[PDB]
Amino acid sequence: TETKIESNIILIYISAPNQDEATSIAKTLVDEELCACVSIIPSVRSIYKFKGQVHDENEVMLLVKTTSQLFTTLKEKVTEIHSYELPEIIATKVVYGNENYINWVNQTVR
Amino acid sequence: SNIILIYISAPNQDEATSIAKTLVDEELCACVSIIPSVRSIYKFKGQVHDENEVMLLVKTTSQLFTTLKEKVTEIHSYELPEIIATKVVYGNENYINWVNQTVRS
Amino acid sequence: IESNIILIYISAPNQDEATSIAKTLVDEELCACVSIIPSVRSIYKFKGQVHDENEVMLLVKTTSQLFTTLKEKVTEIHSYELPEIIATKVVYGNENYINWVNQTVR
Ligand SMILES: [Cl-]
Ligand SMILES: [Cl-]
Ligand SMILES: [Cl-]
Numbered sequence: 001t002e003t004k005i006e007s008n009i010i011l012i013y014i015s016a017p018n019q020d021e022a023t024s025i026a027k028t029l030v031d032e033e034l035c036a037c038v039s040i041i042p043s044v045r046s047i048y049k050f051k052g053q054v055h056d057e058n059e060v061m062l063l064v065k066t067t068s069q070l071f072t073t074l075k076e077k078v079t080e081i082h083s084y085e086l087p088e089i090i091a092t093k094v095v096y097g098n099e100n101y102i103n104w105v106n107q108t109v110r
Numbered sequence: 111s112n113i114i115l116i117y118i119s120a121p122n123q124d125e126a127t128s129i130a131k132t133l134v135d136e137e138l139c140a141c142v143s144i145i146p147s148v149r150s151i152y153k154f155k156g157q158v159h160d161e162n163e164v165m166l167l168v169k170t171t172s173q174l175f176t177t178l179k180e181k182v183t184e185i186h187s188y189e190l191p192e193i194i195a196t197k198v199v200y201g202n203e204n205y206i207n208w209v210n211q212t213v214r215s
Numbered sequence: 216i217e218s219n220i221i222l223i224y225i226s227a228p229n230q231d232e233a234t235s236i237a238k239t240l241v242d243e244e245l246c247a248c249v250s251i252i253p254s255v256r257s258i259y260k261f262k263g264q265v266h267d268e269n270e271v272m273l274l275v276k277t278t279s280q281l282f283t284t285l286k287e288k289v290t291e292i293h294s295y296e297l298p299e300i301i302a303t304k305v306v307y308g309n310e311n312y313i314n315w316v317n318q319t320v321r
Contacts, residue, residue: 002176026151027158037152039165047237048248054238061250075309090308096175096195130258131265141259143272200282200302
């Protein structure tokens with residue numbers, strides 16, 4: 001059985017400097033119903049150039065599941081509370097999903 | 111590119127591995143990357159939870175999404191599993207050809 | 216309206232090669248940043264048998280315009296004969312960060 005509804009689901013990558021902040025950010029977004037769930041990937045290394053030098057720092061990655069309709073409200077909350085001056089908040093589109101899960105995300109969020 | 115990347119969550123390493131090997135063996139995907147030690151945060155009956163999970167990243171073709179979804183729903187211990195796919199917009203040609211030659215049609 | 220930023224998954228056999236690949240791409244300005252996930256298991260079929268090997272995953276952030284050049288660099292330096300270089304679309308992001316990626320790449 002083919003899914004018979006469209007997907008309005010997005011998957012947002014948000015980075016954080018440590019597990020403590022990743023978790024407090026994820027619990028806030030869930031509690032305030034700005035997302036349905038978050039998966040936190042530990043122990044990630046971040047490589048980037050700053051003032052001409054290559055850096056290698058540790059980070060934690062959040063994968064946040066929500067609806068396209070909530071992106072802007074979620075983005076504003078994250079930028080309000082994030083310890084970084086310029087955090088990484090980037091959405092990808094869920095093109096296919098199991099129909100029951102698409103419905104669950106839509107019923108769970110605001 | 112007709113390639114998709116599917117995120118599937120599992121409650122432990124044993125089930126993550128048996129799911130991944132079934133999908134690979136039955137040619138419903140070309141490969142799976144298993145990320146260990148992931149934390150799942152979600153609200154249940156009004157309370158916020160923080161539980162362990164293991165994440166599968168499955169690489170396959172858009173044409174196989176539905177067949178793979180049905181197989182996963184058949185064998186997954188969860189009543190409502192998470193089977194969500196994103197589109198691969200670009201890839202190296204040799205890899206795209208390999209995925210297409212590996213999977214069932 | 217959707218953004219021009221992509222996120223590229225690239226697999227590598229160990230942490231040393233993941234890191235040298237990422238530093239080369241960052242230093243040569245083919246990407247703005249890379250996130251490296253350690254300790255991944257790779258499951259695949261080869262000659263009829265299912266294998267389970269260690270791998271390391273790079274998530275590379277860059278612009279759609281750079282995909283082909285970045286791809287050619289990765290295929291030049293990667294130890295695998297057939298690496299995995301697959302892009303997904305960033306449909307939107309925080310504006311300051313989308314601007315930063317676009318200003319950081321060459
Ligand atoms: Cl900062
Ligand atoms: Cl359940
Ligand atoms: Cl090879």
